[PDB]
Nucleic acid binder design. Structure first.
Ligand SMILES: [K+]
Ligand SMILES: [Mg+2]
Ligand SMILES: [Mg+2]
Ligand SMILES: [Mg+2]
Ligand SMILES: [Mg+2]
Ligand SMILES: [Mg+2]
Ligand SMILES: [Mg+2]
Ligand SMILES: [Mg+2]
Ligand SMILES: [Mg+2]
Ligand SMILES: [Mg+2]
Ligand SMILES: [Mg+2]
Ligand SMILES: [Mg+2]
Ligand SMILES: [Mg+2]
Ligand SMILES: [Mg+2]
Ligand SMILES: [Mg+2]
Ligand SMILES: [Mg+2]
Ligand SMILES: [Mg+2]
Ligand SMILES: [Mg+2]
Ligand SMILES: [Mg+2]
Ligand SMILES: [Mg+2]
Ligand SMILES: [Mg+2]
Lengths: 70, 82, 488, 205, 62
RNA sequence: CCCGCAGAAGAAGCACCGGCUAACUCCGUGCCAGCAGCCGCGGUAAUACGGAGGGUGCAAGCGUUAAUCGGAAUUACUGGGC
RNA sequence: GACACGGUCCAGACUCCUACGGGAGGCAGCAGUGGGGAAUAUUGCACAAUGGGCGCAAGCCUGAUGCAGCCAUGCCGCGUG
């Protein structure tokens, strides 16, 4: 594997099939989707949550949500 | 005119000549009227060296055909043999 | 049948090896003892990597049979087969002129050379260098030229040090031209001797005395004490003293009339290369040693072939190429890279493999740099700013011209104004260039080259812009306007 | 090319002796035949029908030292001929020079016989033939050159072949170190351990 | 058209010349072409040793 | 085409191992990185991803792709139905 | 015996020479170059043989043809003990 970048952000609005538009700490808008661990653990995400997204050098347009926070 | 000429067959370093009655205007391996026999300058002593149908040769020469040098020498040799 | 022999098996070693593989590649009895052997000898770790020479040292410590293998052997085998003569007869000298003005470019040779029809060409500039193996006063002398303007500084370098003697033109009114004083140090650093002349003395407004006094101020020894400088004076039009420059060049050739090999494999350099329809790849080569023949296998850089035909400057075919004589040849697989060394090779099959092996590593390295930069700086490019970028695609007649134009455009770039050339090549403007420029926001520029029907159809259907120029100056002016118009 | 690797592993895989050794020592004194090779050779998995057909084909191919394409050509030729194809192909394989010269008792292993043949050490009908895959005709006479008649390995071969069973369609004279191949056998003279049906149904897919 | 890229990590850029090949992947809808590694600008995948020919990586030097 | 010289001396890689389909175990990650012709593997017990040891099949070759027929009685005259 | 690959005339485009007054050209023949493409070669030797044109014949011509060079493109046999 190769190291990925991690960042903190907020969910602006939800899209069908657990896909979201997310604003990051640096101010870029990125489309994100849910990790399988959440799909097991029945954690739910709605607008206004503080969440962690990892991104990849290959594509910065799309990121992934991996941790939900209060 | 029509003539009897040698056409090459076989493979590299392995020649096999058909004896052919053909128009001189066609290519070496081109169209022809009748095949008459064969010659093989490589065959070993245990195998037939040559074969010709002499009657057809006579028929075509009487019709007016012409003979090449190698074919003529071939007929000479076969007539010497038989 | 079981003796007490210690590990003595043969072991092949590569260029760079490590402990983990070395544990079983030698199969020594002390599995950890082997590990301690390195850690004891020098600073080393579990994952440490040693080199093939250090690996040979290690194998010596272990005492087992050692085998060394390195990837460069392929070049060594080719070098070994080369025929080597031991007879050293005299050779002609190689001399280059550095005149950076049309008079200094041309008139000196024009007077010595048969006629001035060469100067009949437009441009008033030495757009490309020429070579002449003239015979003067029982003396065979090779003369080389120089554009000496704009970005052709690198073009001068290729010829800066290959030659034996350097001749040049001094302008008294100007003192020493900028481009000239840039060119001067290429030979002073080359340590090769320098001889200079004062030309265009036809006009009676000059300061020869001021010039010769400044000879010390240039940074070079004055000849008055037997220095490097020369106070020989020639005239471009009147031409009195050029026959004395002939005497001086003969004298210096006698000063350095070294002996070179005169029979066998021919090694030389590619001075200029270009494309022509019937000719295809043309290689103009200066052959310092050996004698070329038809059928001889030629290798230059990563390109190769057999010399199908060899000719002269008059277009006349010759049977061979004499040593220290330029020659235009055909038979290469493509454009020979500028300045690459040219050698005749013995056998046929190995040359192709050598060239392809050279190509593979070059491709690997260039892709490596490009993708290293891209991967490292993609996320750094997340921020943005005010930038004016202009993309160009370039077709030029000769290799050195491509180099010069690209160099000029890239040096013209500024922090906020960047001239990013997409890609350039020698030859005509073909469909690849047409669709390439059409794809991106760029322009097809033809410098002393033309378009072809295939590219023409795509261009007329596409409304792509083809810009035609034949002088470097106007090209720079127009491109400067082009980038400067983008701002604000 | 040939198979140059370890030999007993082939027998271990196939599970039965292939006579790929001289015979100076019993095969069991050299290897643990019952276990298949590899770390998991103790286990005995299920073998499907296709598996057993493939194993039979591989057994034949390994016993006669033939590569795949040559075997395919042999099968095609046998199919072209008349009669039961198994009989014909069995005749075809036994028609090779290596198998014959080994079977005449001039060698220890088919590999040794082939190495002798490839080195121009034999004549048929007084003509030197080095090609291993040569096919012999009935009433042909096989002999060794006098130049290589001195080989001690041939001498010991003439002796160790004695303890083997001798064929019926062959005649051999150690006095003149020569042989005559009177006629080609049928299926009957060969081992019953060879099941030709599986090979036939395998290739005929 | 669209081309899937095999292997771990890729070296493509907005101006990359590649060679494409037949074959399709089910997950991504509509992708009907794989991309041939080890040809033109597309380099081989770094540091793997099984099925070298598929991704076009040289033999490990001894 | 033949004879002599010296020396094992100058000469083996590719693909695959979950079922279809001949051939398994550990280490490294943890629905990620990845595989894939189809069914489908991967969220810390991966014979399916990567590495290693072992095994299976081809061989001076080994695989992927392109393309025609067969499998297709899936245009059915031989040989299909409402 | 053609409405004629290496013959004639006219028109068109294109390439080239020029005193601008006017002129020249036709590889889908053998090699070879550029270009297109994922992709396909030597600007080789000889008329010793077959066959062809001319001649009384000797003989001359023949990139047909014979042979060679490059390419794991395929079939096929051998070795690396
Ligand atoms: K060997
Ligand atoms: Mg015809
Ligand atoms: Mg070439
Ligand atoms: Mg074979
Ligand atoms: Mg099985
Ligand atoms: Mg796999
Ligand atoms: Mg299901
Ligand atoms: Mg695990
Ligand atoms: Mg694994
Ligand atoms: Mg393995
Ligand atoms: Mg059918
Ligand atoms: Mg049908
Ligand atoms: Mg139906
Ligand atoms: Mg007609
Ligand atoms: Mg023509
Ligand atoms: Mg005309
Ligand atoms: Mg042509
Ligand atoms: Mg191309
Ligand atoms: Mg003749
Ligand atoms: Mg002529
Ligand atoms: Mg071959």
């Amino acid at each position: 594997k190769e190291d990925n970048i991690e960042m903190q952000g907020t969910v602006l609005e939800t899209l069908p099939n657990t896909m979201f538009r997310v604003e990051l700490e640096n101010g870029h808008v990125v489309t994100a989707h849910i990790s399988g661990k959440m799909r097991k653990n029945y954690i739910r995400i709605l607008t206004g949550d503080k969440v962690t997204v990892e991104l990849t050098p290959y594509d910065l347009s799309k990121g992934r949500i991996v941790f939900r926070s209060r | 005119m029509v003539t009897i000429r040698l056409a090459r067959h076989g493979a590299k370093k392995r020649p096999f000549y058909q004896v052919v009655v053909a128009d001189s205007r066609n290519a070496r391996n081109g169209r022809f009227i009748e095949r008459v026999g064969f010659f093989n300058p490589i065959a070993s002593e245990k195998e037939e060296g040559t074969r010709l149908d002499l009657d057809r040769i006579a028929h075509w020469v009487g019709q007016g055909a012409t003979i090449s040098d190698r074919v003529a020498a071939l007929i000479k040799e076969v007539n010497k043999a038989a | 049948q079981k003796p007490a022999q210690a590990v003595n098996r043969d072991v092949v070693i590569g260029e760079t090896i490590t402990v983990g593989e070395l544990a079983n590649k030698m199969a020594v009895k002390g599995s950890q003892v082997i590990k301690a052997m390195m850690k004891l000898g020098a600073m080393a770790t579990i994952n440490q990597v040693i080199d093939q020479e250090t690996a040979q040292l290690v194998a010596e410590e272990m005492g087992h049979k050692v085998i060394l293998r390195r990837e460069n052997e392929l070049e060594e085998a080719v070098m070994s087969d080369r025929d080597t003569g031991a007879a050293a007869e005299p050779r002609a000298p190689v001399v280059t002129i550095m005149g950076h003005v049309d008079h200094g470019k041309t008139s000196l040779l024009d007077y010595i050379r048969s006629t001035k029809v060469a100067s009949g060409e437009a441009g008033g500039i030495t757009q490309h260098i020429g070579a002449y193996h003239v015979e003067t006063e029982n003396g065979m002398i090779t003369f080389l030229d120089t554009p000496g303007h704009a970005a052709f500084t690198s073009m001068r370098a290729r010829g800066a040090q290959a030659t034996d003697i350097v001749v040049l033109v001094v302008a008294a009114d100007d003192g020493v031209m900028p481009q000239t004083i840039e060119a001067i140090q290429h030979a002073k650093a080359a340590q090769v001797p320098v001889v200079v002349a004062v030309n265009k003395i036809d006009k009676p407004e000059a300061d020869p005395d001021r010039v010769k006094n400044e000879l010390s101020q240039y940074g070079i020894l004055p000849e008055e004490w037997g220095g490097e400088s020369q106070f020989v004076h020639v005239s471009a039009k009147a031409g009195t003293g050029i026959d004395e420059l002939l005497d001086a060049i003969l004298l210096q050739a006698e000063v350095l009339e070294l002996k070179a090999v005169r029979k066998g494999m021919a090694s030389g350099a590619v001075i200029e290369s270009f494309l022509d329809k019937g000719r295809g790849p043309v290689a103009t080569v200066l052959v310092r040693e050996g004698t070329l023949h038809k059928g001889d296998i030629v290798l230059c850089g990563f390109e190769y072939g057999r010399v199908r035909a060899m000719r002269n400057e008059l277009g006349q075919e010759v049977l061979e190429a004499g040593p220290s004589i330029p020659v235009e040849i055909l038979g290469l697989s493509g454009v020979p890279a500028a300045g690459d060394e040219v050698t005749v090779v013995r056998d046929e099959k190995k040359a192709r493999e050598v060239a392809l092996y050279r190509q593979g590593k070059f491709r690997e390295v260039k892709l490596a740099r490009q993708q290293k930069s891209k991967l490292e700086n993609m996320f750094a490019n997340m921020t943005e700013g005010e930038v004016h970028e202009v993309n160009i695609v370039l077709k030029a007649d000769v290799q050195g011209s491509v180099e010069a134009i690209s160099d000029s455009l890239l040096k013209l770039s500024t922090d906020e104004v960047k001239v990013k050339i997409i890609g350039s090549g020698v030859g005509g403007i073909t469909e690849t260039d047409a669709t390439l420029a059409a794809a991106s926001n760029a322009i097809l520029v033809g410098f002393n080259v033309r378009a072809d029907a295939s590219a023409r159809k795509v261009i007329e259907a596409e409304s792509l812009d083809l810009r035609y120029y034949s002088v470097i100056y106007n090209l720079i002016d127009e491109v400067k306007a082009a980038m400067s118009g983008m701002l604000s | 090319a040939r198979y140059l690797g370890p030999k007993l592993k082939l027998s271990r895989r196939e599970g039965t002796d292939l006579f790929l050794k001289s015979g100076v020592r019993a095969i069991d004194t050299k290897c643990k035949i019952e276990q298949a090779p590899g770390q998991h050779g103790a286990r005995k998995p299920r073998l499907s029908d296709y598996g057993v057909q493939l194993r039979e084909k591989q057994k034949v191919r390994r016993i006669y030292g033939v590569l795949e394409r040559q075997f395919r050509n042999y099968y095609k030729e046998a199919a072209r001929l008349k009669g039961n194809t198994g009989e014909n192909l069995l005749a075809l394989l036994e028609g090779r020079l290596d198998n014959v010269v080994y079977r005449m008792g001039f060698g220890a292993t088919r590999a040794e016989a082939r190495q002798l043949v490839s080195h121009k050490a034999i004549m048929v009908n007084g003509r030197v033939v080095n090609i291993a895959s040569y096919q012999v005709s009935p009433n042909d006479v096989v002999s060794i050159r006098e130049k290589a008649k001195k080989q001690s390995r041939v001498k010991a071969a003439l002796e160790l072949a004695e303890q083997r069973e001798k064929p019926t369609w062959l005649e051999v004279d150690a006095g003149k170190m020569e042989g005559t191949f009177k006629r080609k056998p049928e299926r009957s003279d060969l081992s019953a351990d060879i099941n030709e049906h599986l090979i036939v149904e395998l290739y005929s897919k | 058209v669209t081309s899937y890229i095999g292997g771990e990590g890729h070296n493509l850029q907005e101006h990359s010349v590649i060679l494409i090949r037949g074959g399709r992947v089910k997950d991504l809808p509509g992708v009907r072409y794989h991309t041939v590694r080890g040809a033109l600008d597309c380099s081989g995948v770094k540091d793997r040793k099984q099925a070298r020919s598929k991704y076009g990586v040289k033999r490990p030097k001894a």
